[PDB]
Design a protein around this ligand. Structure first.
Ligand code: K
Ligand code: K
Ligand code: K
Ligand code: K
Ligand code: MG
Ligand code: MG
Ligand code: MG
Ligand code: MG
Ligand code: MG
Ligand code: MG
Ligand code: MG
Ligand code: MG
Ligand code: MG
Ligand code: MG
Ligand code: MG
Ligand code: MG
Ligand code: MG
Ligand code: MG
Ligand code: MG
Ligand code: MG
Ligand code: MG
Ligand code: MG
Ligand code: MG
Ligand code: MG
Ligand code: NA
Ligand code: NA
Ligand code: NA
Ligand code: NA
Ligand code: NA
Ligand code: NA
Ligand code: NA
Lengths: 81, 68, 123, 95, 50
RNA sequence: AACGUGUCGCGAUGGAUGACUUGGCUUCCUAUUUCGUUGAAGAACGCAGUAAAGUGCGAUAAGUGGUAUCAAUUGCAGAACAUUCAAUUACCGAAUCUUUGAACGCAAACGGCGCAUGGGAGAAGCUGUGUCAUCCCCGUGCAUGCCAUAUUCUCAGUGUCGAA
RNA sequence: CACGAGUUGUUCGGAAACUGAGCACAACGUUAUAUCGUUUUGUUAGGAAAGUGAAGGAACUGAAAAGGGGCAACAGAGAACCUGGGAUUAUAUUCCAAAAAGAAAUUGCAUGUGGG
RNA sequence: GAUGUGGCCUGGAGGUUAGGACGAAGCUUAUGGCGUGAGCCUAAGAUGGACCGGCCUCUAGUGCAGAUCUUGGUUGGCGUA
RNA sequence: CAGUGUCAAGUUGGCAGGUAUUUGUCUGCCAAAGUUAAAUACAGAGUAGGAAGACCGAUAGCGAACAAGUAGCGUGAGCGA
RNA sequence: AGACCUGAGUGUGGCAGGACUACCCGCCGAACUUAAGCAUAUUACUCAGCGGAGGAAAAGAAAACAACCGUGAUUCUCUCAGUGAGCGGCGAGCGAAGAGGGAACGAACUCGUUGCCGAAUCGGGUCUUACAAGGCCUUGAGUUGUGGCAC
């Protein structure tokens, strides 16, 4: 019977963790990520979901290198005499 | 664009500047200009200059003057 | 404990010796940090760590400056490891330099000299 | 070389062996099996752990048993040779 | 079961390490707004599914 | 009389209202203002005496260096150059910067496995010392394509010639 | 719920290191678009994809060998250990210490004895 | 259904006049007075703790009883099934 | 403008001159390589600084005044206090 | 023998892929909707999709307008103008340009060709305090033509 019993029938998992984005969207059989399209070189990006783009874009991480180079640009790549 | 002969040539070193990266992808070569209609000027090209989108933008946007 | 001035005045072998001693001391303090220990003993872990950081800072600054002056000579400049070259930005590194930017044809130079831009006024 | 940082060989054993353990099981292994218990670097080798034991405590490790704890750290059960006493080494360590 | 990749084991280890209450001295601090960890996790309430 | 009704005083439950706003929204301006193979954005894991989250940082890890500033930080603890060597702050030229990721030696629900090349450690034998096979550890290089190039490298073609 | 602990391997399972149904990097082609197609019926690609056994005077040179590189089985293939313990609060063919409780098997290098 | 109203009311602005720790806003009422009414004003708090009223003009996200209305809370059924 | 077919002329020449054609005058210009600052955009971007508002005032204003793209949900794309 | 010229291998030096994507440039490309139905039309050369750059981009120095007493690269603003233009089941609807006042403006240059030369050019080593717009060397590239000069 569909419903409760068949909920009991569900074994395994379609997805596991993605090495690239970490979202548990990596299709095990197809070996590609449903969230970031890994291992394709470029990431998934669709304008019909600006919300997902705003979730994933630059600035939602720590920007560990971007902050430093932004400071260096702001200071005109100043160097000791 | 990395060859020193190119970079030190005033006749061709304009193309080293990054605004010309993949200019063919943006229709900026002679063939691209041809299919953009940019072989024509004046009354044969008024709706497509400086581009179709540019002319559509300035012909279709609603202007709200401050005192109107 | 190690003042940075003493470390600047210190040799590379002596710097490595004092790095070994400070590492050993931090290890012993980790042992103490496992078996309880007094607040005074636990409270020197951070000075030891910052001193180790200072010794490594002096060592690496000295090594990088010496290497930069090694590859600065005409003979070895073009083989400089990319970690020692100026970073700036990717686009700036690829961009035309002022000398390349300012190249002119000989006709352009003759024209620029023949008719220089003038300063003038009107009454 | 594109790696310029000053790395010294005289402090690697301090990374390999982090600190000893003092739990009841560890103490019982010290007394009864001549075995010291350490938290070690999780990426470290059994062979490197033996070498670091020699370098740091001047003692011979006859057997290193390792496990990664459910908290993510690697623990080493190190039996010393019968020429060395685990209790004396633990005392010098301060255990 | 017995099998897990070491990476999954490390993620589960970090989740175990995070499943701790707030120290009380954190509540004694000057501008403090935290009193419970609020990200506490019980194995029966919510799944990590690693 | 008992439930039950009404009204008033006082309580409870419940969090509206008012004052408060280090927030939002909208408008305007100034610039030596625009990332990445010199490895980015993003993911992951760690780092404090005490430390879950968050913030900050990267095995130099709630930070190193420098220039200013001048007496703290503060929940406790700990520390105690002051004419500036401060767990102060601010800013920035020097440094550091784990596993990844375009990810690029090959793979990967594997903290996996190589080739070349530099090193390190190294039992037993040898004169405590050096030396060191197998094993082990670390650095560097090694994807594909394209451009240039070879103080003029090595080749292929029943392509076209041609030797003396 | 709070505090403090607990998972021990030459041989067990995996991987190093097999092939299967299959997958699809490269290559090539296609597509305005590669985020498409082909890719085991012995097998990629108009397709020059092999880089080293030897020698010969210690690492430098090179024959013949047709059809590039990977992945996909924790129940197929494969795989050298097994009893005793008075040995835990919780692990154990994983721990036990010279009378290893002990008994083995099996790799990789080296050292001797001996050979016909 | 149309229209009028030196008609009522609310948040802000330009003016002008006031008030407040000797107690502002808010909130409570067998708390009276005024108005046909929208409402206004006083009193009392054995309430509160810091802002705010009137008048002219300007301005708007400006007035609720119901939309199987939205969100939060409560509630009889019920010490029941 | 594009595909395909077909394809010139040579300044006694071409192109344009907003009703097709064949003539013959006139006017402007010289396609089928290329570079170029400013005045313009920023209609869901960023970096470093600034200035404001007749705007909103915790069910409002961004979803988010707070360890908020968090807790939680979904196999997932996503959803989201 | 050898050559060039077509194509390989390796060494050396370098570059591209990713991110952002508000605005901008190239393609691709709807339907709801409106027409009181609906198919042309409209929505719309829009959304969604695929590419590419910047601090802006794109455009830009007349094979331009005009028909004047003439203007004079581009871009932008008011206006021309919801138009006695035009397009349109001539329905619903749609829809510009020149001139004029202005912002900006030191705005102009390069090649190819022609004709006069013809390696005077480039790269690479190496000296000058110097990967010099310099000297010296150099077959390496280039005569299947780089570079100079002129209207
Ligand atoms: K579930
Ligand atoms: K309020
Ligand atoms: K209708
Ligand atoms: K004008
Ligand atoms: Mg194990
Ligand atoms: Mg699992
Ligand atoms: Mg923490
Ligand atoms: Mg790859
Ligand atoms: Mg519990
Ligand atoms: Mg197969
Ligand atoms: Mg396999
Ligand atoms: Mg096995
Ligand atoms: Mg009525
Ligand atoms: Mg309002
Ligand atoms: Mg309203
Ligand atoms: Mg009503
Ligand atoms: Mg251009
Ligand atoms: Mg609230
Ligand atoms: Mg809100
Ligand atoms: Mg439609
Ligand atoms: Mg609509
Ligand atoms: Mg219909
Ligand atoms: Mg679009
Ligand atoms: Mg531009
Ligand atoms: Na993309
Ligand atoms: Na199980
Ligand atoms: Na625990
Ligand atoms: Na109401
Ligand atoms: Na055509
Ligand atoms: Na890119
Ligand atoms: Na850019």
């Amino acid at each position: 019977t569909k419903g409760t019993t068949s909920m009991g029938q569900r074994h395994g998992r379609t997805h596991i963790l993605c090495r690239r984005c970490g979202r548990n969207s990596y299709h095990v059989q197809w070996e590609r990520c449903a969230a970031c399209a890994y291992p394709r070189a470029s990431r998934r990006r669709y304008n019909w979901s600006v919300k997902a783009i705003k979730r994933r874009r630059t600035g939602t991480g720590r920007c560990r290198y971007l902050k430093v180079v932004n400071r260096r640009i702001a200071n005109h790549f100043k160097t000791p005499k | 664009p990395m060859c020193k002969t190119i970079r030190r040539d005033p006749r061709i070193n304009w193309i080293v500047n990054s605004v010309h990266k993949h200019r063919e992808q943006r229709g900026l070569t002679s063939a691209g200009r041809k299919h953009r209609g940019l072989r024509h000027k004046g009354h044969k090209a008024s709706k497509l200059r400086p581009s179709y989108r540019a002319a559509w933008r300035r012909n279709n946007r609603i202007v709200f003057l401050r005192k109107r | 404990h190690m003042k940075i001035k003493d470390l600047r005045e210190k040799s590379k072998d002596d710097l490595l010796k004092t790095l070994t001693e400070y590492k050993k001391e931090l290890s012993q303090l980790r042992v103490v940090q496992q078996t309880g220990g007094a607040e005074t003993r636990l409270g020197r872990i951070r000075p030891i760590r910052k001193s180790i950081a200072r010794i490594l800072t002096v060592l690496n600054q000295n090594e990088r400056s010496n290497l930069k002056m090694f590859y600065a000579d005409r003979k070895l400049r073009c083989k400089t490891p990319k970690v020692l070259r100026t970073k700036l930005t990717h686009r700036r590194r690829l961009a035309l330099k002022e000398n390349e930017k300012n190249r002119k044809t000989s006709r352009q130079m003759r024209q620029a000299h023949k008719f220089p831009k003038r300063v003038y006024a009107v009454k | 070389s594109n790696r310029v940082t000053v790395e010294s060989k005289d402090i690697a054993a301090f990374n390999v062996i982090r600190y000893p353990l003092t739990t009841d099981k560890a103490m019982k292994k010290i007394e009864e099996n001549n075995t010291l218990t350490f938290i070690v670097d999780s990426r470290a080798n059994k062979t490197e752990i033996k070498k670091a034991m020699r370098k740091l405590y001047q003692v011979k490790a006859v057997k290193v048993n390792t496990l990664i704890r459910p908290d993510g750290l690697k623990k080493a059960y190190i039996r010393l040779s019968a020429a060395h006493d685990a209790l004396d080494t633990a005392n010098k360590i301060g255990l | 079961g017995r099998f897990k990749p070491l990476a999954v084991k490390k993620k589960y280890a970090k989740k175990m390490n995070q499943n701790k209450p707030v120290p009380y001295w954190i509540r004694l601090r000057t501008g403090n707004r935290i009193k419970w960890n609020e990200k506490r996790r019980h194995w029966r309430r919510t799944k990590l599914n690693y």
